[PDB]
Design a protein around this nucleic acid. Structure first.
Ligand SMILES: Nc1ncnc2c1ncn2[C@H]1C[C@H](O)[C@]2(COP(=O)(O)OP(=O)(O)OP(=O)(O)O)C[C@H]12
Ligand SMILES: [Ca+2]
Ligand SMILES: [Ca+2]
Ligand SMILES: [Ca+2]
Ligand SMILES: [Ca+2]
Length: 341
DNA sequence: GGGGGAAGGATTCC
DNA sequence: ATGGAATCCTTCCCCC
């Protein structure tokens, strides 16, 4: 088996540049504002110009500005970035029929019955970096190896505009010498847990009793890491299917006033129901971010589908269970439809 | 002893 | 300090 993984370089910022080529060479930060105060909000992504000074995804806009006051701060235009991605995904389906669109800027190609050896692989890699650069004027990074995970690690190593092949013998030196926090699925919480278990490199999972491992990181992560380390991971490329839609908005100010919140809550629903297309969810969740950035949500499943009018009614109820049950002020409120028929 | 769901929270990734 | 979505984990639930 051979996986070719494609990762679109500094994606949103790169789109804003493509759409205004004057931006190239300049620090570019794609911002998501919140309209509480003037520069309230957070950073979505930024180019490598900006990123080289610590301006990354997730920091507040405010921080970013202290660091690079004269950078180009642009507001997020997701609709736009979505149409552009789509076109590249269509283009991608013209190389393998076996394709997993994993995110707005990521995809996996199964190219086993379409190439022999990593030399051919590598070449088809170049054909795609190219075709995209020509068609949609976008740089990407490509990773090639035997499974999705090592395909994706390969890409992570070559970013940006890179390409990298991990062969089977290097996969082995990796398992020995790769930091576990660098494995996909291992956020900061899981990395630290493993540290305490004295698990630093992929190989360390073999030296520990499965039950203790399972006890610390759950059964799924457990078997995931273990199979990865045994050179036995081989999960299949398949058409991902969208299982929930939803909106979340930030309120001008934190509050516990039902009548103050509702106008944000219904706007979330309006946007949500627009985003639904013609899909009918059986389920609805009302999602609150309390003042301390904790998250809490009540939901409900129907035996039928949920009309806009009905969803209004239930969301108001579910909002109340929150305010009743939880005792915090609420900073953000949104909705999420799922269980579509 | 176990299969489903369903709900609430956890964690991750882009 | 945003906003979107997936996955997995525990408990609870009903019932066989
Ligand atoms: N923390 C984040 N918040 C909002 N959007 C995010 C995000 N992290 C990643 N993204 C999006 C936008 C960004 O361009 C992206 C990938 O980031 P990347 O180009 O790899 O740097 C497609 C995701
Ligand atoms: Ca990317
Ligand atoms: Ca990581
Ligand atoms: Ca909590
Ligand atoms: Ca990425």
């Amino acid at each position: 088996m051979i996986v070719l993984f494609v990762d679109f370089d500094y994606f949103y910022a790169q789109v804003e540049e493509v759409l205004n080529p004057s931006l190239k060479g300049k620090p570019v930060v794609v911002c998501v504002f919140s309209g509480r105060f003037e520069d309230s909000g957070a950073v979505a992504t930024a180019n490598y110009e900006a990123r080289k000074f610590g301006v990354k995804a997730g920091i507040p806009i405010v921080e970013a500005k202290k660091i690079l006051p004269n950078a180009v701060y642009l507001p997020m235009r997701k609709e736009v970035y979505q149409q552009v991605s789509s076109r590249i995904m269509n283009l991608l389906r013209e190389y393998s029929e076996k394709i997993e669109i994993a995110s707005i800027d990521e995809a996996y190609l199964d190219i086993s019955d379409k190439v022999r050896d990593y030399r051919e692989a590598y070449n088809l890699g170049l054909e795609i970096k190219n075709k995209i650069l020509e068609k949609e004027k976008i740089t990407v990074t490509v990773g090639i190896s035997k499974n999705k995970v090592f395909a994706k690690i390969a890409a992570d190593m070559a970013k940006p505009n890179g390409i990298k092949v991990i062969d089977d013998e290097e996969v082995k030196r990796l398992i020995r010498e790769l930091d576990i926090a660098d494995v996909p699925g291992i956020g900061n919480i899981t990395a630290e847990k493993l540290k305490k278990l004295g698990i630093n490199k992929l190989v360390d999972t073999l030296s520990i009793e499965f039950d203790k491992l399972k006890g610390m990181i759950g059964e799924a992560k457990a078997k995931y890491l273990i199979s990865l380390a045994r050179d036995e991971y081989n999960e299949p490329i398949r058409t991902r299917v969208r299982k929930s839609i939803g909106r979340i908005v930030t309120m001008k100010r934190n509050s516990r006033n039902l009548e103050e919140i509702k106008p944000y809550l219904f706007r979330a629903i309006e946007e949500s129901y627009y985003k639904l297309d013609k899909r009918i969810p059986k389920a609805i969740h009302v999602v609150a971010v309390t003042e301390d950035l904790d998250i809490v949500s009540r939901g409900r499943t129907f035996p039928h589908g949920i009309s806009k009018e009905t969803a209004y009614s239930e969301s108001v109820k579910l909002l109340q269970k929150i305010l009743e049950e939880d005792e915090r002020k609420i900073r953000r409120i949104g909705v999420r439809f799922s269980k579509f028929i």
